[model samples]
Structure formats: structure tokens, C-alpha cells
Target: GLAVELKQSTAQAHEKAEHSTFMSDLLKGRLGVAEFTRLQEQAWLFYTALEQAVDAVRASGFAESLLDPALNRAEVLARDLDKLNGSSEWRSRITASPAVIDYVNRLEEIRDNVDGPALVAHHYVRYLGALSGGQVIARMMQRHYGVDPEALGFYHFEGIAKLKVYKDEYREKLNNLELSDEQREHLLKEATDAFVFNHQVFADLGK
Candidate 1:
């Protein structure tokens, strides 16, 4: 199945991305609260655009399909920023880098069309990536920074206890999406674009 191949083939590219400057610093415990908050702010930028894309797609008649409330992260990101920055006008303190602006712009551009396959690509890359590597990030944050689990709501799923079950269901949906070969190719390309955008964002941060 293309679905199976998609996951397998993208593994290298995804793993390469994990070695980005920001991620390396993060794993090394070299990033402080300010740098970490910057990364989370970029996450805020991404998820806000993503959730808006979701609302747009749902409103455009894909409501019953591909939409998952539990997958939403913008609200969770808000709580995290609040906990991290406290009452010091964190919003004003945070700034989006050029790569982040480009990333969000690309999301908005794709979102204006609101199709199923591409939307699924975006959803898969962000949410599933979160479920996978995001767990590692949360643990590292706790280990290095001693932040409370209560503040890490962005990494914690409130309702879903069994992550593998949910991920399996999501993959099943992707397999059953009834896409043509060309559409599947395009979807894979879009997923790569998502990764590339993420890589650029991390690189920009490191610079």
C-alpha cells in the first residue's frame, strides 16, 4: 500500500530533520527558557494556522471526515505559553521568524482550497509527528528544565489514553482515502514540504 510505503520512505527525511540545530540544542539541554519559549512560540504560530485550516475545511463540507478535536493543539499551546511566560505579556515578547512566516503562509495557501488528501497530509505530519517525536521533546523539557507536567498540555492528550490505537485508526483512514496514484504522489510531496518547512524553521531559529 502507498500508505505503508509513505511511512517507510519518509523515515530518513524525517530523521534527518530531527538533527536540526534547534533540536540538537534542545536535546543537549543547551536551550534556556527564552529559547524554548521561542520554539514554543513557533509551535503556536503553526498550530494556530492549522486549527484555522481545520475549521475552514470542516465548514467546507469535510466536517464529518478527517477532523479530530483531540488533535487540536492551538489551545494547548496557549496554555503552555501562559505557564511558561506567566503574566508578563508573553504575546508581545514572542516573535515569528521568516521561516515561520513562510510556513504559516503556505498552510494558509493550501487551506484556502480545503481538499481532503492535502489536509490529511498536513494533519498527519503535525499531529502524528507530535505523537511520536513530540513525546520525546516533552520528556526532555521536563528533565532539563523541570517544568511542571501541568504546563506541558501541548504534548499531553487529554482524552486519548492509547496513542497507538489512535495512530492505527488514522493510518487506516489514510489508506482508505480513495486517492488516485497521482493524488497519493502529491500528498507525499506535500508531506515532504511540511517537513522542509519545519526544517527551515528550525534552522532559522538556530541562526
Candidate 2:
């Protein structure tokens, strides 16, 4: 049986998804090429933290069942990074500005070093789905504003509902983990930190 969960705050992610276009278009419209590129570089650097985190947890040996899933997600992200190579979506969208292209180009340079499976599960599987109105905002982020799929890659596109199955799976794996209550809480704290890391990144991006 599942114990009741008391969610104190939704983190207002739905508000974010709903409000993304306002900022995205504004970002596209207002920022000069250099400023936007620097902004994107900031996002890219933060994502590098996320990417490293996934690998870090994998090394912890608590992720037996999640190994395949993490590898799969990483593969897709890797492929997307490959697709971005010389793809020119950045070129097409950045006609109004070229900063994102520079930012994206930089991401491509660092992707190969990112073949691990640690970050996605901690961030994408556990936390992103729990974000407030995350599913609601995700649909908006993808369907509403017509933000190109490539640039918006950071959002973990599957939606919050994916958490139902994901947590079931995660709990299954975690329930099977041989850890003390204190250790479990510690790992959970790390996961929570991962989620907070994401919010901070988005907040930075929103600036």
C-alpha cells in the first residue's frame, strides 16, 4: 500500500509552463545575439551539472533496474545532440538573433562526454514530474508556443503523468535497494537537491 504523501508546495511549475511563451518570445525578441548566447551558456553549464549527476548516482550501485532506462534516455539525448550538429534549427530560429546558435554549438561540443545515465533519473524521473502544474505546463511548452523541439530539449518532454509509472518503477527499484532509512533519506535529499537545481536553472534562464 502506498503511504500518503504531503506535498507542501507544488513549486508552481505549471505556472512556468503556462508562462513560458511569454518569456521565450520575449527572450527571442528582446535580447541581442550576445546576451542571449551568454544566457544559453548558463543553461548549458547547469545542464552539465545535471548530466554529471545522473552518472554520479549510477556509480552508487542503487540504480540496478534503472540502468537500462537511464541508458535509453541518455541515448536519445545524445542523438538529439547529434541531430543538432550542423542542423541549423538554431540558424532558422535565430534569424532575429544568433546567440542561441552559439549556445547550442557549445552544447554539441560537450555532449560526447555525457554518455552516462545518472542525471536523468534523479532529475527527470523523480523530480520534474513532481513540479507544480508540470504536466499542464509541459503541454503548453511543447504544443502552445511552438518552441522548436530541439532548443526546448531540457524539459524532459514525457510529462508529469509519466511519474506515476516512473515512481512505481523507481520505488520498485528503491524498495529493493538494501539501504538503511538514513541512507534512503540521504539519497532522497540528493534527489530533492536535484530538483532544486533544476528550478534554479530555469529561474536563471527566465532572467
Candidate 3:
């Protein structure tokens, strides 16, 4: 199944991202609020492009059932940024990092091509990672940096009661998707690239 294959194939890439210098520092509370806020700001750009790709590929059948609207995080990120910065003008004060620009460009390229499998690869990477680790990140920020709970809205999934159950079901949906062998390989490669993109974003943030 694609879900299982994705997990196994991307394990190294996933670990690299999880243990990236920026992420490790943030988790250890070595980073401050400003750096954390910058991470969220970069996330805003990534998720916005990803969600746009989701919309673009909705008619492609591959993403019809896999990409759920309830998982959207762009708007949530916007609100979090506004609260974190204590100003509605946060957008004016920030620019997309080079890594974020590359990430967004990849998403837009997939959207422009209406590549369903590629879209699903990115969807699995971002949303599933969020569901798995976002909880830990939210708590660490609150515990270490003393960020207000209200400013960490991106980690909260409103309608999902059991995150494990929801994540399991999402993976099942991925396995159920019908794909040619070529498409399956493409999806796997895309998922790997997605993790590299994430690591690059972390590196950019650390800079």
C-alpha cells in the first residue's frame, strides 16, 4: 500500500527533518519566540500554496477523498501569526524566505500541472506530519517560550476528536487510491522531496 510504502521509504528523510538543527533547537527551548513566530510565518506560505494545490487537484480523483478541508491550516496560521506578533500588520513586516519560495514554487508547479498524485504526496507530508508532531510543538512553545495558547491555533484541529483514529483513517484513504506503478513511484519521490523541502525551511529559519 502507498501509505505503508511512504512511511518506510521516507523514514530517513523524516528523521532528518525531525532532527534538523532548527527543529531540535526549538524543541530544546534554545530558540526564542521570535524564531518560533518566524517558523509559523514560513508555514503560512507553505500551507497556503499546498491548500491551493489541493483545490487545483480536487477534480483529479487522486485527491478527491484524501485531501480534507478540515485539515486546512493557512487561515489558522494567519490568525496565529497575527496574535503572535500582536498586530494585524504582521504580513507587511514579513517576506517569504528563499526556501519557502522554492517550496511554494514546487506546490504551484504541481497545481499548474494538476498532478493529483504529486499533490497527494505533499498533502501526506505536511498534514500528516502536523497531525503527528504539531501537538508536541504547541506544548513545547507554551512550556518553554511561554507563548499564549491563543497564538498557537495552528496546532489545534477543531473537529478531530481522536487524532490517532483520524490519522489512521487518512492513511487508509491513501492506500485506497488507485494508481499506476509509475504514479506510485512518482508519489514516493515527491514525498521524499517534500521532507527535503521541510528540512531546507528549517535550515533557512536557523540562519
Best by lDDT: 3
Residues 6-115, candidate 3: write the lDDT tens digits. Answer: 99999999878878899999999998999999999989988999999999898666558778899999998999998988887888888899999999999999999999
What are the C-alpha RMSDs, in order, of all predicted structures? 1.7, 8.5, 1.0
What digit string (tens of lDDT, one per residue) describes model 1 on residues 13-101? 79878788788888778887678888888999888998888777767765335577878898888888898888548778677789999
TM-score of each: 0.93, 0.47, 0.97
- Count steric clashes of candidate 2: 4
Q: Which residue pairs collide in model 3, if any?
A: none
For candidate 2, write residues 1-207 as lDDT tens digits: 111111222235424533554345533454333343433444444444444455555565544455443323333334343444435244234331133344333333323334222233244433435333344433544464444466434345443356567656654554455555565454444344444444444454555
List runs of model 1 lying over 4 Å from the truth: none
lDDT for residue 189 in candidate 2, whole number 0-100: 46
Q: What is the lDDT, from 0 to 100, of the residue 10 in candidate 2? A: 26
Q: Which candidate number would show the highest TM-score if scored against the true structure?
A: 3
Error of 3 at 29 (Å): 0.7
Per-model clash counts, in order, read 0, 4, 0
**Between candidates 1 and 2, which one is better according to lDDT?**
1
